[PDB]
Design a protein around this nucleic acid. Structure first.
Ligand SMILES: *O[C@H]1[C@@H](O)[C@H](n2cnc3c(=O)[nH]c(N)nc32)O[C@@H]1COP(=O)(O)OP(=O)(O)OP(=O)(O)O
Lengths: 924, 336
RNA sequence: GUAAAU
DNA sequence: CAATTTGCATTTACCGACAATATCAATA
DNA sequence: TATTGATATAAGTAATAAATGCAAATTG
């Protein structure tokens, strides 16, 4: 059924409201059935399939696959019951401390209580689905890696146990998950049977036989063993023939009921499925900090912004869907779709008595061909799954609940089909609600078409003139999308341009353009968002002017400026002998310098710029494989040109990086109750934490993960422990502080703007930097954007950041060396010797830290006696407070506990941020 | 004839790329007396001989002086050693070249296209009396080169298309210990298996006396190594240096399937053979239990197995109807 | 590796 | 301290990345 | 009596020392 067309045909708005209410109350049940995962339902499905196929007959079909799965479960259940009974019989007084071989000692007590809780059949279904779900994953040709399989089984059992528990605490360690998974997987290896057919090398005749469906094994890769589970080829073909995705768990799909509003981090998004506000991969510190902030109640605005982002309804486009369907039905590769590849082709076997270079080349050719074939197959499967979702959800309300990564940027829950996808997935989505085009709708729609061609740096007048100069082309391209002028496929973003051409054709055909109702979103794309935020932070003038902060009637583009600078530099340098200039002088385009310049302020080294320009030079005819010399030369020249172009941003970058370096090399006082045991060098357990204006706390996890071997029934898996703590990473914190800070400031701005737009009754959809609204409400959206950016950047954010660092890392001690000839060093030596000569220890730094903590406890408490004692108690840290120039103090030696100081803020510029209210050419 | 270098000239050099060399002519004299080169090579005058990684070249000079072969060629790419050899052996009948032995293109171009050094192809029945090769791969991380040459022995493509070419190879003591293990020892691995299958080597010289504990004590008697002090090698710091002689022998098995079986049966070494056959493929354990009738074989660990029963296991595995992609995989395991 | 953002 | 070394901007998602396992050594 | 730390595995995506691509960093 096509509910969208019925809604559009509704004459009266009251009728529309009644229809929406009826649709929601009817579709609650459909959402409930769509959201629920099928384990027990899979059980009776398999049972019914087996009982119905027992009467009809026996074949080798998908029904036969379900029958054999039912038989596998039926044979599993006695084994699981026997194992659980064996575990339960051990719960009596534990007479033997170390007898019963090693299984009883190391595994029976290890995972006894864990298996006895969940129902056996649920775990059997979980493991069967888990193994039949991840065929050919992790680099294995026809199987999965053992560690990934066992860990996934353990986590699935965790989720099932928690789902049972809430309908009636603790989260299991990684080792327990690994052991449970290994036990179940080994049992299924034992009990898996399937009939196979093959040829005999002696009889040359078919010999029917039975072999286990799953078989453990090991494979090598560059001198490293790698455990692997293998699946028989017959099961592989049956899984391939099992439609596309029928029994393999579909878990995350767009909703139909309006999403549940966010109130706390645990409750949000889907109705009956738990969700989290932050996508914490494996870190517990982020979860703890987010829970503390939510309990305090300082993230309300984030909740409102996410609710507004997830409250907008979507529909699947119809004409674009028809075009995609007609392109896909040809079974080939279009400009965008890679296509479907039929067969796998290989070069013939070379003679073994040939030079080893020939064999090596043949091996590389085979590997490359296999990788290309598999990449094409994966892309085809992804596009096919997207099209299946689009066809299934055609003509019905779609809602996209959102979350935030640890920085704060918003991403939808639906991973496969969402508005952040590629151009094909972006074309297939339009707003459910329709708005009156109005006097300004035509202009903005024409601007959108103009800037989907790449013409986004032209004045609005030039853009509308260009759009109106191609009315015949638009009409021809929209009247027959395929087998015609093919003008839409020449766009920079083809399918969005096709949809906008449809909308323009309809509005041109209409006699009265003002009353036309259009559902097409209009992309208002921010220009150099990172540079804009850097200019707003530092308060620069020239940097603000070059990034369209100041009001002007003509676009200013930094990427074009740097491209022209590079071209002039090379032309001056091309006179004598620069053959690299001969190859690349006029062939320098805005894209390469755009990428390099835009990433430069985040700390891109030479290798990153080289790789970026090499990637953006491959389709520029220079070469297909070897462009590294040209790329290196161009990176050198680009760095030489940009070294002086940005100055205010670089100071903030350097300050943030050095602050990250200082924080990541500091040890606190309180948690040092247990000595670091190295005598001299402690282990650092401090990570950069800061709070954005929206209140969301960002904790850079960036920890050095240590992996160990934990014994399992199958093998010993090499895994890490997420719950376990460990020292932070030295380089990642410094390398990621400024990118994270800039990528969180714009996310905060987007959240504020979305909240205001929702308060103003608008439809808002934001792809990170860019924001989508209707073609009519663009003016109000722009006003809201400017107002909210002004409110966000009316304060010196870096000053508040330094204040937050000072308040949080208040009593932190760094370790550093001092010159022995210094009088202060001699005083510190005298104090340490006087304190620790009678105690016995050789003035160990741990005792000094403990006594400094004691001084902090005494002299900071408001007790008069405690204050007097603190005045009568002096330590190394307490003594070293006379001079505020800690760096200038030090400028062999003995290390002491230097206090943690952060550098002075870079000088804030004299620029008025408010001026951009009239700067129309700032975000468009 | 050819002036042998001395210790002072060697110490004047700066970089040796980690390769350890011996520089006393007495040890080379006794090694050549004991080694019995002249018995296998009926006419050393007509012998055409190739040398790999010469370096110092003292052994080169001693060999040429004592035997006077038809053509003895030095293949080097290291700059300092090449300059040293060019300076010392100026105008010598010794042929100094500048090519890198690591690349197969070096041998291909030097033999086929350029025809500078053309050995004569003989039958694979007896030792090629007209061709001899010498290698000095003593680098820390250059074990892969030796192992690839060992594989090329079986495959017969690199230099063994000419027949049963004898090699006098210098290798680190640990590599020799890995490559000279006997069934039941704790140093047994696939490298030892391929060495035993393709060649019948005999250790000749070894630096560290205490290092002899690693090898099988039974075989030391008929090997009779020549012991020389650790201070004899110029790069005194580093691991000991051993010598092995390579004599390829005829084989009656298929290299690819035997290699697959030995590689997948050496991952689990200490596990009994009863439960390790499952690693070969789906259901291989049942078939191998049915086919094998020697129970002592099933009670033996893969370390205890010698190459004969490895060939046997390969033969049983060929007749198995439900064999996996042993060759149909075509060495496609992982791209990353 | 491919797509998405700066 | 001058000489040698290490990794290479951040994020999300998806597929085929995710240095890993087994056996012999040392210690609590 | 377990519990850790060490080492080989494969075998062209090498090693070495040269000369960086350039900080920014151990470290000997
Ligand atoms: O070029 C990549 C690619 O071939 C492969 N690779 C890495 N991650 C994946 C993945 O998730 N899926 C597939 N199919 N292939 C993958 O590894 C090659 C080399 O990677 P790098 O060593 O450059 O490391 P990284 O993944 O971080 O590279 P990049 O994506 O930042 O360029």
């Amino acid at each position: 059924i096509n509910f969208f067309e019925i809604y559009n045909s509704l004459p009266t708005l009251e009728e529309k409201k009644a229809f929406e209410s009826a649709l929601n109350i009817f579709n609650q049940d459909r959402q409930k059935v769509l959201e629920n995962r099928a384990t027990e339902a899979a059980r009776e499905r398999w049972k019914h399939d087996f009982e119905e196929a027992k009467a009809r007959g026996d074949i080798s079909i998908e029904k036969n696959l379900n029958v054999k799965l039912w038989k596998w479960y039926n044979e599993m259940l006695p084994l699981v019951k026997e194992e659980i009974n064996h575990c339960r019989s051990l719960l009596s007084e534990k007479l033997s401390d170390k007898k019963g071989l090693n299984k009883v000692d190391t595994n029976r007590l290890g995972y006894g209580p864990y298996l006895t809780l969940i129902d056996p059949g649920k775990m059997c279904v979980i493991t069967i689905l888990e193994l039949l779900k991840l065929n050919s994953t992790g680099g294995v040709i026809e199987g999965m890696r053992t560690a990934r399989a066992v860990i996934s089984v353990g986590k699935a059992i965790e989720m099932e146990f928690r789902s049972e528990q809430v309908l009636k605490k603790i989260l299991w360690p990684q080792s327990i998950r690994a052991r449970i998974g290994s036990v179940l997987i080994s049992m299924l290896i034992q009990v898996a049977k399937v009939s196979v057919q093959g040829v005999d090398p002696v009889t040359k005749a078919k010999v029917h036989g039975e072999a286990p469906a799953f078989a453990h094994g090991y494979q090598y890769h560059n001198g490293s063993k790698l455990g692997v589970l293998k699946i028989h080829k017959t099961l592989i073909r049956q899984l391939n023939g099992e439609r596309l995705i029928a029994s393999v768990q579909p878990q995350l799909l767009p909703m139909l009921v309006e999403p549940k509003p966010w109130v706390n981090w645990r409750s949000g998004g889907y109705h009956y499925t738990q969700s989290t506000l932050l996508r914490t991969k494996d870190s517990p510190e982020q979860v703890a900090y987010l829970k503390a902030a939510s309990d305090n109640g300082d993230i309300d605005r984030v909740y409102d912004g996410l609710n507004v982002l997830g409250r907008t309804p979507w529909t699947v486009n119809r004409k674009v869907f028809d075009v995609v369907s007609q392109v896909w039905n040809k079974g080939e590769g279009f400009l965008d779709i890679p296509g479907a590849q039929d067969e796998m082709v290989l070069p013939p076997a070379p003679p073994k008595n040939s030079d080893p270079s020939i064999l090596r080349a043949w091996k590389l050719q085979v590997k490359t061909i296999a990788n290309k074939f598999s990449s094409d197959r994966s892309n085809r499967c992804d596009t096919n799954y997207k099209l299946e979702i689009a066809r299934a959800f055609l003509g019905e309300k779609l809602y996209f609940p959102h979350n935030l990564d640890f920085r704060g940027r918003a991403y939808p829950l639906s991973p496969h089909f969402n508005h952040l996808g590629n151009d094909m997935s972006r074309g297939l989505l339009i707003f459910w609600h329709g708005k009156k085009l109005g006097p300004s709708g035509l202009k903005w729609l024409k601007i959108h078409l103009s800037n989907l061609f790449g013409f986004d740096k032209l004045p609005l007048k030039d853009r509308v003139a260009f759009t109106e100069s191609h009315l015949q082309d638009i009409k021809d391209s929209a009247e027959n999308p395929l087998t015609g002028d093919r003008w839409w496929t020449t766009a920079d973003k083809p399918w969005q341009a096709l949809a906008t051409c449809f909308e323009l054709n309809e509005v041109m055909k209409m006699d009265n353009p003002e009353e036309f109702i259009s559902h097409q979103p209009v992309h208002q794309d921010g220009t150099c968002n990172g540079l804009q935020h850097y200019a707003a932070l530092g308060g620069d003038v020239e940097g603000a002017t070059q990034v369209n902060l100041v009001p002007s009637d003509k676009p200013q583009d930094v990427y074009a400026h740097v491209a022209r600078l590079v071209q002039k530099r090379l032309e001056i340098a091309a006179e004598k002998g620069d053959e690299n200039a001969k190859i690349l002088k006029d062939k320098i385009t805005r894209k390469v310098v755009k990428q390099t310049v835009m990433t430069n302020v985040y700390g891109v080294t030479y290798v990153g710029a080289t790789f970026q320009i090499a990637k953006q030079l491959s389709p520029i005819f220079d070469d297909r494989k070897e462009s590294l010399d040209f790329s290196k030369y161009l990176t050198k020249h680009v760095f030489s040109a940009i070294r002086e172009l940005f100055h205010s941003a670089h100071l903030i970058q350097d300050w943030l990086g050095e602050s990250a370096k200082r924080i990541s090399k500091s040890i606190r006082l309180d948690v040092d109750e247990k000595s670091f045991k190295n005598g001299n060098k402690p282990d650092f357990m401090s990570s950069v934490i800061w709070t954005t204006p929206l209140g969301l706390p960002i904790v850079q996890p960036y920890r050095e993960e240590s992996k160990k071997q934990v014994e399992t029934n199958l093998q010993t898996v090499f895994i890490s422990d997420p719950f376990a703590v460990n020292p932070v990473n030295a380089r990642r914190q410094k390398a990621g502080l400024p990118p994270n800070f800039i990528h969180s400031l714009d996310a905060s701005h987007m959240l504020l703007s979305a909240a205001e737009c929702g308060k103003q009754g608008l439809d808002f959809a934001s792809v990170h930097d860019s924001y989508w609204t209707h073609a009519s409400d663009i003016d109000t959206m722009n006003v809201v954007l400017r107002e909210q950016f002004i409110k966000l950047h009316e304060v010196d954010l870096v000053l508040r950041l330094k204040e937050e660092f000072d308040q949080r890392y208040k009593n932190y001690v760094k370790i550093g060396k001092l010159k022995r000839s210094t009088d202060l060093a001699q005083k510190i030596i005298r104090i340490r010797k006087d304190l620790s000569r009678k105690l016995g220890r050789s003035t160990t730094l741990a005792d000094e830290i403990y006594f400094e903590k004691k001084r902090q406890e005494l002299l900071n408490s408001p007790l008069i006696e405690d204050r007097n004692v603190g005045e009568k108690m002096v330590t190394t840290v307490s003594l070293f407070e006379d001079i505020t120039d800690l760096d200038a103090l030090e400028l062999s030696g003995m290390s002491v506990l230097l206090p943690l100081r952060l550098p002075e803020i870079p000088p804030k510029g004299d620029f008025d941020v408010t001026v951009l209210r009239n700067s129309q050419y700032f975000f468009s | 004839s050819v002036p042998i270098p001395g210790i002072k000239d060697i110490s004047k050099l700066k970089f040796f790329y980690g390769f350890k060399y011996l520089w006393n002519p007495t040890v080379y004299n006794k090694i050549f007396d004991k080694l019995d080169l002249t018995k296998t090579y009926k006419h050393p005058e007509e012998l055409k001989v190739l040398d790999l990684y010469p370096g110092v070249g003292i052994q080169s000079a001693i060999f040429y002086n004592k035997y006077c072969p038809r053509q003895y060629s030095l293949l080097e790419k290291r700059s300092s050693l090449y300059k040293f050899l060019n300076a010392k052996f100026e105008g010598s009948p010794l042929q100094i070249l500048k090519r890198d032995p690591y690349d197969w293109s070096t041998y291909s171009n030097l033999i086929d296209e350029e025809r500078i050094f053309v050995p004569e192809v003989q039958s694979s029945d007896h030792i090629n009396d007209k061709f001899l090769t010498v290698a000095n791969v003593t680098g820390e991380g250059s074990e892969g080169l030796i192992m690839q040459w060992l594989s090329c022995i079986g495959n017969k493509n690199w230099l063994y298309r000419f027949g049963k070419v004898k090699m006098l190879l210098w290798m680190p003591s640990t590599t020799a210990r890995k490559l000279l293990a006997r069934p039941g020892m704790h140093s047994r691995s696939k490298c030892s298996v391929v060495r035993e299958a393709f060649t019948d080597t005999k250790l000749i010289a070894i630096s560290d006396a205490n290092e002899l504990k690693g090898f099988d004590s039974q075989c030391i008697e008929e090997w009779d190594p020549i012991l020389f002090s650790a201070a004899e090698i110029w790069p005194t710091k580093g691991k000991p240096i051993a010598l092995v002689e390579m004599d390829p022998i005829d084989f009656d098995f298929d290299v690819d399937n035997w290699d697959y079986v030995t590689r997948h049966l050496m991952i689990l070494k200490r596990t009994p053979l009863n439960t390790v056959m499952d690693s070969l493929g789906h259901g291989g354990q049942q078939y191998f239990n049915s086919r094998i009738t020697d129970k002592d074989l099933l009670k033996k660990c893969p370390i205890d197995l010698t190459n004969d029963e490895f060939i046997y296991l390969t033969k049983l595995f060929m007749e198995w109807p439900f064999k996996p992609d042993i060759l149909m995989d075509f060495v496609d395991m992982y791209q990353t």
